[PDB]
Structure formats: structure tokens, C-alpha cells
Write a protein that binds this DNA or RNA. Sequence first.
RNA 1: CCGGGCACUCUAACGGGACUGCCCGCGAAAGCGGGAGGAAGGAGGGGACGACGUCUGGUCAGCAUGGCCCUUACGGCCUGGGCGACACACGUGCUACAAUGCCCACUACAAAGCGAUGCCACCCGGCAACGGGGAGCUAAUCGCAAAAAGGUGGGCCCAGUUCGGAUUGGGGUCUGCAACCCGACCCCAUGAAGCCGGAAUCGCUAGUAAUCGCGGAUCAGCCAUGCCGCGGUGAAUACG
Lengths: 98, 80, 206, 155, 127, 118, 24, 60
Amino acid sequence: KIRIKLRGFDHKTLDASAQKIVEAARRSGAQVSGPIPLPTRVRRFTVIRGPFKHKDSREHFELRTHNRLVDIINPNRKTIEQLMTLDLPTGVEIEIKT
Amino acid sequence: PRSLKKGVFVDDHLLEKVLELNAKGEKRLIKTWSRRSTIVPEMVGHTIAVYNGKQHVPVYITENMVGHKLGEFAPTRTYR
Amino acid sequence: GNKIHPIGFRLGITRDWESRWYAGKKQYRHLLLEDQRIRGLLEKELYSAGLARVDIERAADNVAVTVHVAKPGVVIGRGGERIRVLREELAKLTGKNVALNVQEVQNPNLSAPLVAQRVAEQIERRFAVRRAIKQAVQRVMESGAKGAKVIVSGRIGGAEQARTEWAAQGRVPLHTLRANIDYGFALARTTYGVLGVKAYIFLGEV
Amino acid sequence: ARRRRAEVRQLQPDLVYGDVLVTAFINKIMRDGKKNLAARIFYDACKIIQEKTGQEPLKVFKQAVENVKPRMEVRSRRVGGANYQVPMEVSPRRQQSLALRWLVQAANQRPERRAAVRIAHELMDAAEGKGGAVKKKEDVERMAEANRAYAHYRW
Amino acid sequence: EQYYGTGRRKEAVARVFLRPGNGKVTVNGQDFNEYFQGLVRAVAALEPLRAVDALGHFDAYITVRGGGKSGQIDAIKLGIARALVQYNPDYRAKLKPLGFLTRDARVVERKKYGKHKARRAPQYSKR
Amino acid sequence: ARIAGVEIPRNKRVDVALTYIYGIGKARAKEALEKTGINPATRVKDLTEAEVVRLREYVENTWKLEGELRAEVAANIKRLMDIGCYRGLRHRRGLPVRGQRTRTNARTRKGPRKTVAG
Amino acid sequence: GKGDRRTRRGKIWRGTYGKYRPRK
Amino acid sequence: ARKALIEKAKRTPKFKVRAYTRCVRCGRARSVYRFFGLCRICLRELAHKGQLPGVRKASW
RNA sequence: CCGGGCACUCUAACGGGACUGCCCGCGAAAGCGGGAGGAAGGAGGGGACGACGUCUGGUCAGCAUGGCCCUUACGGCCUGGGCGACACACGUGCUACAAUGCCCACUACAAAGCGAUGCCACCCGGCAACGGGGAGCUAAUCGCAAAAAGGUGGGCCCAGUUCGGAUUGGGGUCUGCAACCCGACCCCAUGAAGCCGGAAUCGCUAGUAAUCGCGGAUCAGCCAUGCCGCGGUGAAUACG
Ligand SMILES: [Mg+2]
Ligand SMILES: [Mg+2]
Ligand SMILES: [Mg+2]
Ligand SMILES: [Mg+2]
Ligand SMILES: [Mg+2]
Ligand SMILES: [Mg+2]
Ligand SMILES: [Mg+2]
Ligand SMILES: [Mg+2]
Ligand SMILES: [Mg+2]
Ligand SMILES: [Mg+2]
Ligand SMILES: [Mg+2]
Ligand SMILES: [Mg+2]
Ligand SMILES: [Mg+2]
Ligand SMILES: [Mg+2]
Ligand SMILES: [Mg+2]
Ligand SMILES: [Mg+2]
Ligand SMILES: [Mg+2]
Ligand SMILES: [Mg+2]
Ligand SMILES: [Mg+2]
Ligand SMILES: [Mg+2]
Ligand SMILES: [Mg+2]
Ligand SMILES: [Mg+2]
Ligand SMILES: [Mg+2]
Ligand SMILES: [Mg+2]
Ligand SMILES: [Mg+2]
Ligand SMILES: [Mg+2]
Ligand SMILES: [Mg+2]
Ligand SMILES: [Mg+2]
Ligand SMILES: [Mg+2]
Ligand SMILES: [Mg+2]
Ligand SMILES: [Mg+2]
Ligand SMILES: [Mg+2]
Ligand SMILES: [Mg+2]
Ligand SMILES: [Mg+2]
Ligand SMILES: [Mg+2]
Ligand SMILES: [Mg+2]
Ligand SMILES: [Mg+2]
Ligand SMILES: [Zn+2]
């Protein structure tokens, strides 16, 4: 069991990093279950537009944390040969739990 | 419906002062800026001046008013 | 009372954040504070060096502060001297062991914040604002830039009453978010008052 | 309706009869968006009205709604000072709407304790030619034939 | 053998499986009349089969979820429609003129600020 | 059906008819019906003389009741009134006690509206 | 209805718990 | 707001209750979002700038 | 639940799809009426977006800022008090005046969010608020959690009441240094006005109004019935 929890503020960045990881692991390993998408944590913030009222003008923004899962099955060495440190994306964030 | 629920809170300020005042006999007017504290039995007989926020008003403390607070007898408001 | 900030509109498509990293409940606050401190320092010192954008990236305790300059000679300095002091002063505020990066921006008249700084400079020394405006719009228009636009705030030329300035050219459609509209704000602090300078620049289509 | 004709909503047919007027009446009974409770009201009233009088509730419902539909009414028209009550005929759609509204309002102005009982007895009285809804209808018609002296203000 | 129709109505999903049989329809471990007990519009769920003369020719098993039970009933209706079409496509000639193959796209509308519920404006008095 | 200090409910359910006693609401009525071993849904007329006597036994002397209760509450008012308490002042001036606003909607405690000019 | 705090609807309106609306 | 009125930053409030948010940039006295440590005005301007990653224009 | 599998619902990333393209009609054209096909059409529904300017509109009491006044002092710390005052008047709301209703058991169906001392399954104690113990969840797996209207069953019987919960007396928990001024909550008791509201006036044209609950931000706590979102059921009517 090698869980790879992928999280980010950018969805194309998550797709890029996850697909690169899977393409690296597809040349060594199994029938890997691959890129499963998880629901996104949506944080909304409503803010009154103008300081010193006009109460009924507020606009809101939304941040969204996207999550992806990999679940590589039976990787030994060649998978982690293409894994140690080779990635471009910066806004991406990766965790590994076993 | 009023509740303090355990170790009924009385501030140290007047607590130690009055428990040492009782030992030498009853004293005259005391100074009180802490109306947050609860009245305790041994306070009966004294004359306690409490703060309105502006003034210092004396209060005769009796057996009947033990359970209440200091400040129930010092009205903050002034009307008519 | 209208016309919300254009870059805030644009952040999603055809525009990117000045800080692109990830955080959580326990980290985002003082990390954002640290970003604000970085931009504050770089606006204290590097204003006259012709800087436009500060892009900060974080992977894991790695910082990638990227300074886009119109004149990299003042940022690097002779023999690299000035990339030693304020690159160390940068780490004398944050204990994150951060390194600094420089990059070139072509046509300082093509970047809207730089044009705003330029017009604000010419305003602080009290030039006739409309000439600076039209000249800036031409500097923009003389190299691509299918649209250009300049707005100046009240008390123009020192006048008692507040006014509003003008003279855009080309086509500057702030309403539609398609075509990479860049925006910059500058603040001219003068004896008569304060003058806001808004530089809108339209270039490219998709 | 300044621009368009405001096309009439076509109600869904009914699950029991297959008739649209029943669905319209059930909507007129509904309040706070409870079409289930309103349907139960109307159908328990259907059972009661079919039992207390050995007739089909279908034709009694139809005959009652037909009896309550008025043929003339009054509208106010501003002419030479204060406005006047001018009589005129009625649209068939508006006749339908007014008939159902008077039915429900006269049913709930009745003494009967339960709602379904009110509905059933109101429908019975209206099907016989009497009751409160038909009284309001005949007062509407009595407004006509009375101010008919304004028959030249039809508009 | 068996034919499948999904259907969807107002945030409800009703997977419908149709086979031949006697006309017994079950839902989530309950008969159709025990789970929708005492609902006047529960008969509209098996309405789409009355243009094809089922309920004695057919038999069903349905699993439904989401929203309210009325949306469940209408999603059951639509799912029965699509299962009936995949069984016999000619049934379309009797289905769409009735309107049983159309996805009802009426959704609850989002709430807007400055309002109470998405269109109700707060009452003012003495303008 | 006389139970407490003068109190005669009639022709209703017993637990409901006990609310008509002063110091008894729904909770104490349910408690009386519980510990007295009486069917709550019974009418007042159908109450046994033994059931009525047991209800009298319990309700009469387990809580303080009508006259004692009214006098106890009023004497509590007089008690916190004769002391110089602020709560006593609010009871004197006829104003709300629980700590509400008196700028508007103090009607229940202050009585009908007496509109002065402005 | 909802203002009666010793009934179940007044308890769910205030969101509290007690004798008239036990948790479970 | 006022400099001394950011005395919360040295917290030592003599009592744990006296901690309030006090938006870092503007020194907001009343309305501060705890997650960003900023206030609605500072949050609005900073999200307009583009310095808060992931913050987009909400629309649905 | 397991073995196992992705077909399904789903989650979330990229796409396809509608264009008056087809037909009848009318028309010089745009386009209009009608029809088939289609999940959907004549802008399919909802947002984000608000022109040159206006009212010398709003706030220097968010910020930044140009000038004029303050300096043992308007600056500054802390305690107490105040912004909660009441013989009144309006604005916005909440709860209601009940039988399409109330209460009691029993049972079923949401979406959107939130939670590392923070959410707190579960056992125990207590009528209860809540306390003690304690598992799990770095949360499509755990928890907030029960959705509420609804369904069946039952009681109430047109009555200031098994409507309505204001007011007040007492007892008690909790956050907190501390609830007199001035908190929420629980329990017993008290059970007010109010039986659809004068002149006048407001919102809404489709899942809309109406009604029902849920969540969130701010926050130790909370006077939130506010505000910002979420879904459940689901109208009436538009001659003009
Ligand atoms: Mg507001
Ligand atoms: Mg600039
Ligand atoms: Mg000039
Ligand atoms: Mg653009
Ligand atoms: Mg919606
Ligand atoms: Mg709704
Ligand atoms: Mg207003
Ligand atoms: Mg009640
Ligand atoms: Mg200042
Ligand atoms: Mg605060
Ligand atoms: Mg605080
Ligand atoms: Mg398995
Ligand atoms: Mg496949
Ligand atoms: Mg057409
Ligand atoms: Mg057509
Ligand atoms: Mg068609
Ligand atoms: Mg559209
Ligand atoms: Mg659209
Ligand atoms: Mg649109
Ligand atoms: Mg547009
Ligand atoms: Mg102005
Ligand atoms: Mg003014
Ligand atoms: Mg200044
Ligand atoms: Mg105030
Ligand atoms: Mg006076
Ligand atoms: Mg559970
Ligand atoms: Mg998972
Ligand atoms: Mg699961
Ligand atoms: Mg997981
Ligand atoms: Mg019943
Ligand atoms: Mg009365
Ligand atoms: Mg009563
Ligand atoms: Mg009545
Ligand atoms: Mg409209
Ligand atoms: Mg809270
Ligand atoms: Mg209060
Ligand atoms: Mg709430
Ligand atoms: Zn701020």
C-alpha cells in the first residue's frame, strides 16, 4: 500500500504532476488504478464591497483545494527510479502515506 | 435564575481585607472598586462604599442581602 | 461607483497569481504575511530600479522569489555586489534560507505598472499631465499593444478642485476578459495632495 | 404583459380522473406548497361527496364549477372625474379561475370542522344551485344589470 | 432478459431494471407501495407503462436515492421510460408524444444576496 | 373534582385538567398521573373516589401550591424590594428585570401605551 | 409553536436539548 | 487603526478571553477573517492584487 | 460485511452538443409564426461583468493623504462604568392568533459546508443543561448527524385551550479572572397580549412566491430572530 495524496490550488497543475507520476510508474509497474479524483474543499468568503456601508453590495470569492489519488500497486525499484525528484510543478503538493 | 455553580467567586481584594478587618472589630467605610465579587456571610454589619463608575455610595450590609452582589445597591443609572 | 479591479477579474484566465504555492489551516496566515514582508522590502528599496512584478513560489521550505526588472543592472549591481546585501537582508528577516532570482522585462513602456510609475514620476515633478498621458499611450502603441489607456486622479496640476484625466487610444475593453489586459497603479504624493495613476494596457487576443 | 401574450401554463393532468380542472382545483386548495395534503383533502372530500349523495363526484364537480362561473362583471374606468363601474363579459379562462377561487374561499368560510367536509359540502351546494360561492357569483352578476346605464363605456 | 433505465429528476437518481413477470415492483428492500405509502402521486411512477400495457406483462426492481420522495417518483418514471425504450425502441412512438422521455431540468435556484430567498426582496415602508 | 386548595376541574382529561391548579403544569401533572397510578386519558367525571383521594394525597402535600405559592412569590418580591437591590428597583418602577432593552417593546411589563407628544 | 421552549419544535428551532427533546 | 491598539500582538492579555483577531495589514478593529489574518477590505484588495493563491472570482 | 468487479450513480478533468442547420408559411432583408428531430432552442436557466457621466452622493472613523489645531497635554496605561439607559415615535424582523392545526411516540428521503484539543461516535451519571471516561478521523472512509416539513398510529374537539410563550418567582449547568449593571442554556412553576389586524403600504411572472429545515463566516462565550449559502415540497396569475 503506497498512498499518494495530491493536493493543490490549481487543477491543471494537479493533472500535470499526477499524470507525470503515473507515466513514470507505468513503465515499471502493474495495471495501476491510477488517477482517481477526490471532491474539492471549497472555502467561500463574502466581503462587503465598500468600506463604510452600502451593506447590500458584497461580493464573494472562493478558494478550492483539489485532491487526487494514485494507488500504485506492487512497485519495487524502477518505479522509484523515476520518482525521487524530477518534477516541475510548484503549486502542487504531494504526501505519501502507507 | 442566577448561577456561579461551584466555589462561589469572591475577589481576593475585599476578601483578605474584610477577613482581617473582622479580627480587630467592626471598621467604618471601606473602599470598593470591585463590584464583580460575591457577598459572603461575615460581611454583615459593615458599611461598604461602592463605585457607580463616577461616585462612591455607602451601603449598609445586612443579613437579608448576603446571597446577592455588591453593586445591586449602587445604581449606575440616574433618571427622574 | 463601479469598475472593479481588472487584475482581480483576470486572475482565473489569462493572468496568474503573484504567489503560487499551497498551505492549510495552520500555515497560510504568516506565510502570506511573509510574502507581504518580501514585497514590502522590495518596494522600499527597488522602486527606482525599475521593477514590475514579484512572483514568489514555494515547494517545501524552498523559496523562489522572482523579481522582474526593467533594468537588471541595478538589481545585480557591479560585480554582483547589490545581490549580496539585500539578498542577505532578505534572509535576515525570514529564517527560511531563501534565495533570490532576477528576470528581464522588455519594453518597460509595455508593462502597465511601469508606465504608471513613469507617469507618477512625471507628475511628482509637476509636468502637464496630459502630455505625459498621451506620450505614454504612444510609447505603448509604438510597439504592438493593440490598446492603451491612462487615467489620472483629481487635483491635476495643483488645482484646488479635483478632476479626472483621460486620453486612451486603440481599444481597451475592460468588460471582456479574453485578451490579457494588464493594469498598474501608482501613487504620486505631492504638496497639493495625492494623485492616483491607473495604467491599462491591452495586448494579444487569446 | 407589455410585450408578450403571457402564454397560459398548461397544468399536468390528474392521476385519478385524468382531468385538468381537478388538478387546477387541487392547486387552488394547496397552501404553503403542500400539494400532497391538498390532494388528500380533495380526494377524501371526493369519497365523502360520492357517499353522502349517491352520484359520481366527477359530474357533480363539473356541474358545480359550471354553476359558479359568472357571465358578467364590473371594472373601474376613469372618465370625467372619479372612475365608474363599467360592466362587461368574462374570459373563459378567467371564468375558470374565478369559479375555482370562489369555490375554495366559500368552502373555507364554512362551519364544518374538517377541510374535506367543507370542500365536499361546498361542492354539493354549488352543484345544486345554492351555497356561498354561487351567492358571490350572483352578486358579481348583480353588479351587472344594475350599473348597465354605463353600457356605453365598455372599452 | 433484463433492460436498464436510469432517469433523473430534481437531484434524484432511480436505477430501474425491467424484466418480464407479474407486475411486482420493489424498491430498496421494500415493495413499491410500502416505501411510498400514502402518496397520491405514487401512481405516476408506473404511468409510463400504461401506453405499453405493462403490469402483467412486466416486472421491475428499482433502487432510488437522493432529494425528496417526489423527485424519486419522477426519476423512477424517467428510468422506466428509458428501460422501456431500450427494451423496444418502437415504444418511442408512444412515449415522447406523452412526454415521458424528457429530462425535467427545473432546479431549485440559488440564493442571491440582498434577498431573503433568491428572489424575495426585503420590504421597505415609507419611500 | 376537588384536589388542592380550592380547585375543581371537570369534563376534560385529568392530566390536562390538573394544569388548572396553580402550581401544576404539564410536567407536574404527568408526574402526578405517573406516581399516583392513574390513567391520564381518563375523563374527570370517571375518576374514582379512591383515585381522586390518592391524587389529593400526592398533589396536596408534595409541592407548595395556590395560596402559599402566590404569597411566597409576592413575599419574595417584597423581600428583594425592601433591600436596596437593583432588581427591587426594577420591580418598583415597573420595568423588565431579565435584562432586556427598554427603548422599545417593553409593553408587557410597562402596560398599555401612553403617548406623549414630540 | 417555535417560541415554546419546553416543546419539541421550540427545541429544534433553538437547536438545544433537554427533557422535552432528548438527543437519542 | 492605532498602533498601541495592536497590543494584542504581544498577547499576554492577563486573561485568555481578551484575544481578538486584529487584521495584520490594516490593523482592523472590527471585522477580521481569521483564516487569512486579514480584514474584508484588506482581503478584497489583496485578492484583487493576486497575492492570495487559489482565490478566484466566485460565480455559479 | 467479505471475495471481487467498473457496467452503473457518483466524484473532477477534458471534450461533444444549437447553429433558426431541416420543412411549411409570410416577408425585399433581418427576422416572425408553426412542425419534426433532440437532453435541450430562438438569450435553455443562473451568475461574474455595470458605459461618457450624474447627484459638490459616502467614509480622511479602514487605509493612504493635502492643509489647520493638541503637547504632562486630545497622545498613553489600567481599574470601574458606558455604548444595553425610557413617559414616547418610526424602520427592519421573529413568534403568533390555530383543526390544511398542536403535541406524542414510530419511521423515510437532502444538498452545501465545518472540525488537531478541534469536531466529539460510544458507555456511565444526571429529569435536563452538562459532567466523567473514551474510540476514531491528518477526514468521498471519522465526526458535527438528528435533516425538517412528509408517512402510518394516537390523543386534543372549536375552548385565551393540549392554541400563544410574553412576563415573573425559584432551582441549576457552561464558557470565562469575572455574568449587579449586562451572557447563553437547562429544569419546576407562573401562562400576558393576540381569535387575521384602521387609513395606508411591500415582495414575487417558474421551481418563482409560499413554507420547511441545514450549514457557514465573525467568535472563549453569546443576547444571530441578523447576514451569507444549501437543498425538501411546490403554486396562483398576466385581458391589457
Ligand atoms: Mg447588513
Ligand atoms: Mg505601479
Ligand atoms: Mg496637467
Ligand atoms: Mg482580458
Ligand atoms: Mg441550485
Ligand atoms: Mg427554497
Ligand atoms: Mg435600504
Ligand atoms: Mg404549547
Ligand atoms: Mg492615521
Ligand atoms: Mg472580534
Ligand atoms: Mg473577544
Ligand atoms: Mg474489496
Ligand atoms: Mg472503461
Ligand atoms: Mg420553431
Ligand atoms: Mg415546434
Ligand atoms: Mg418541439
Ligand atoms: Mg441564457
Ligand atoms: Mg446562460
Ligand atoms: Mg446568461
Ligand atoms: Mg457582457
Ligand atoms: Mg464625493
Ligand atoms: Mg456628510
Ligand atoms: Mg498622515
Ligand atoms: Mg447599539
Ligand atoms: Mg422622563
Ligand atoms: Mg452516529
Ligand atoms: Mg478515499
Ligand atoms: Mg465510504
Ligand atoms: Mg481518504
Ligand atoms: Mg390524527
Ligand atoms: Mg382576551
Ligand atoms: Mg394555555
Ligand atoms: Mg379559535
Ligand atoms: Mg422579471
Ligand atoms: Mg458560533
Ligand atoms: Mg438579552
Ligand atoms: Mg441560524
Ligand atoms: Zn484590514
